[PDB]
From a paper:
TcdA and TcdB bacterial toxins are primary determinants of disease pathogenesis and are attractive therapeutic targets. TcdA and TcdB contain domains that use UDP-glucose to glucosylate and inactivate host Rho GTPases, resulting in cytoskeletal changes causing cell rounding and loss of intestinal integrity. The GTD domains of TcdA and TcdB catalyze transfer of a glucosyl residue to a nucleophilic threonine acceptor in Rho GTPases. Iminosugars, isofagomine and noeuromycin mimic the transition state and inhibit both TcdA and TcdB by forming ternary complexes with Tcd and UDP, a product of the TcdA- and TcdB-catalyzed reactions.
The geometry of UDP, isofagomine and noeuromycin bound to TcdB-GTD was established by solving the crystal structures. Electron densities for UDP, isofagomine and noeuromycin were also well resolved in the crystal structures. The binding of UDP and noeuromycin is similar to UDP and isofagomine interactions. However, the ion-pair interaction distance between the nitrogen cation of noeuromycin and the β-phosphate oxygen is slightly weaker at 2.7 Å. The C2-hydroxyl of the noeuromycin also interacts (3.0 Å) with a β-phosphate of the UDP. Despite the extra interaction of the noeuromycin C2-hydroxyl, the combination of this interaction and the weaker nitrogen cation to UDP interaction together caused reduced inhibition potency when compared to isofagomine. Here, noeuromycin was 7.6-fold less potent than isofagomine, thus the C2′′ hydroxyl group does not improve inhibitory activity. With UDP, isofagomine and noeuromycin gave KD = 0.067 ± 0.019 µM and a KD = 0.180 ± 0.070 µM respectively. Isofagomine and noeuromycin binding is enthalpically driven with ΔH = −10.3 ± 0.1 kcal/mol and ΔH = −5.2 ± 0.1 kcal/mol, respectively. Movement of the loop from residues Gln510 to Asp523 (10 Å) towards the binding pocket occurs on inhibitor binding and is highlighted with the black arrow.
Numbering used by the authors: 2 to 540
Write the structure that this text describes.
């Protein structure tokens, strides 16, 4: 409970020192805060913000004041009061589950995962967000990348047996060709948009694919039809009917990632937070599954011979092996267990008849109007799981973080692209500008932007997490606890972030599909795909 006016007067007391206007401003504001019983949680937080600002105004005005020590202690009590305000005043979470699949046909694997959530949360409305205008982005990315592969491997033909022509050389040379093909498409998209602003993304994409890659417009229309029909009868919710998002400051960023960068994870990052802000509820990646009942595998001890991650995977594999809720779910990890351990799993699952005995239900959830709750793995916070009440204060802060982060990026990126040079020259101008504009505040953030042009086309490029992903969420939490906006220097520790954790029992994160990233890939996969592309091209 935050100190009252009398308690602060005692802390900041200085014998025979004038009560300065700036000091009385603080005391008045603190007194007002303690008479705000019947005000909203956000109103109370905005008051605590004022009190913090007024306290800073004082310490800045009277630099050598005997009050300053006690006022620095008071600024700490304000932060504790934000957390107490967040933990003790909770409203219901709107019973919505938000999924996103944009850029192409939703796979049966995605639907089968979504259906688990539906079966165990019959009291929840389910939105599977799609873009009715952009069903051909994934077909465009795949066509350009496969053509870039063939163009690269052909350039390798003779100097092939040479170990200098490794997987690293392949991806560097292929990137140059992907960039040229990207620029060609973006230039066509813009040309078509000035000629006829009525044309939608899929109109332009399918005409581009007909012109440049001899694709049949009739086949592409059939694919759109089948994809639109499929999502239509799986709780489909059209982005092109989401007016608040379309009229907002983030839609140009969403289309930047959808249309120019072909990064559907980045576009998903921008959409999911808008959905939570405007509607409220819980966002889940299509690779997440419901929480396993805590008591289910209580009786089965984890072998020392197996990692924590291995064990969490085998739990889901066990369920799917014996209940077959998701057809052709892997048993790769379960099948490595000793027969006695496999038997323990079978015997437990044989004693369960209903899915509600395997997976838990979200039920009535409540959160602070201040907060967006976020999922955790061993590496820290991850936006694959998000809970927020409609129009939460943090949902607003996170939108503003993403918008500010893209402003800094585009400011350095757009000049470089406008010079209309090759990938290396463009990369060089971009990084020069990044390092030029970097300061003490945004230094760390700027050092992560360098690979933006390569996202999805080159191994171990994770730029998106700094722009639209987890780092935006960490920054938004810092904004809340520091009574400010626009944090770039993240100094929060685990203990701070853990106040915003989603309970581990609400999501099963260790799924088969979670282990296969859709927008990034590591060295292991790079090496593997290179060899796969080589034997395919020369047989
Ligand atoms: O073609 C795509 C690829 C990805 N996504 C979205 O991107 C999210 C994150 O993808 P993934 O789980 O592969 O990211 P990771 O967990 O590997 O960071 C998914 O849940 C989808 O909402 C999409 O809509 N279309
Ligand atoms: O921010 C980009 C991705 C980071 N990993 C998350 O699981 C995924 O949901 C995001 O799209
Ligand atoms: Mn994932």
């Amino acid at each position: 409970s935050l100190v009252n006016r009398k308690q602060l007067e005692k802390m900041a007391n200085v014998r025979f020192r004038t009560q300065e206007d700036e000091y009385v401003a603080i005391l008045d504001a603190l007194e007002e805060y303690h008479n705000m019983s019947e005000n909203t949680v956000v109103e109370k937080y905005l008051k605590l913000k004022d009190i913090n600002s007024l306290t800073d105004i004082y310490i800045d005005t009277y630099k050598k004041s005997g009050r300053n020590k006690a006022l620095k202690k008071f600024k700490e009590y304000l932060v504790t009061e934000v957390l107490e305000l967040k933990n003790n005043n909770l409203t219901p979470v709107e019973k919505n589950l938000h999924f996103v699949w944009i850029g192409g046909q939703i796979n049966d694997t995605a639907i089968n995962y979504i259906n688990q959530w539906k079966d165990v949360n019959s009291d929840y409305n389910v939105n599977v967000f799609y873009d009715s205008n952009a069903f051909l982005i994934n077909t465009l990315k795949k066509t350009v990348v496969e053509s870039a592969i063939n163009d690269t491997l052909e350039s390798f033909r003779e100097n092939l047996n040479d170990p200098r022509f490794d997987y690293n050389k392949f991806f560097r040379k292929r990137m140059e060709i992907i960039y040229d093909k990207q620029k060609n498409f973006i230039n066509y998209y813009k040309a078509q948009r000035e000629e006829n602003p009525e044309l939608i993304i899929d109109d332009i994409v399918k005409t581009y694919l007909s012109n440049e890659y001899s694709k049949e417009i009739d086949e592409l229309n059939t694919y759109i039809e089948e994809s639109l029909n499929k999502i239509t009868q799986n709780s489909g919710n059209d982005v092109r009917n989401f007016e608040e998002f379309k009229n907002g400051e983030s839609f140009n960023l969403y289309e930047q990632e959808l249309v120019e960068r072909w990064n559907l994870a980045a576009a998903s990052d921008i959409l999911r937070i808008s959905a939570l802000k405007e509607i409220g509820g819980m966002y889940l990646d299509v690779d997440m599954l419901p929480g396993i009942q805590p008591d289910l595998f209580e009786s089965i001890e984890k072998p020392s011979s197996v990692t924590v991650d291995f064990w969490e995977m085998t739990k889901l594999e066990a369920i799917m092996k014996y209940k077959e809720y998701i057809p052709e779910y892997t048993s790769e990890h379960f099948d490595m267990l000793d027969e006695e351990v496999q038997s323990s799993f079978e015997s437990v699952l044989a004693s369960k008849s209903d899915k509600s005995e395997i997976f838990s239900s979200l039920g009535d959830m409540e959160a602070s109007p201040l907060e967006v709750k976020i999922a955790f793995n061993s590496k820290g916070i991850i936006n694959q799981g998000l809970i927020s009440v409609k129009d939460s204060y943090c949902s607003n802060l996170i939108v503003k973080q993403i918008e500010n982060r893209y402003k800094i990026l585009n400011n350095s990126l757009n000049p470089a692209i406008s010079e209309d040079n090759d990938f290396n020259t463009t990369t060089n101008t971009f990084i020069d500008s990044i390092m030029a504009e970097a300061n003490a505040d945004n230094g760390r953030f700027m050092m992560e932007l360098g690979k933006y042009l390569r996202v999805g086309f080159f191994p171990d490029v994770k730029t998106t997490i700094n722009l639209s992903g987890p780092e935006a969420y960490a920054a938004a939490y810092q904004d809340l606890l520091m009574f400010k906006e626009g944090s770039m220097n993240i100094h929060l520790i685990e203990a701070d972030l853990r106040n915003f954790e989603i309970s581990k029992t609400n999501i099963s994160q260790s799924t088969e599909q979670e282990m296969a990233s859709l927008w990034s890939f590591d060295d292991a996969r790079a090496k593997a795909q290179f060899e796969e592309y080589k034997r395919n091209y020369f047989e």
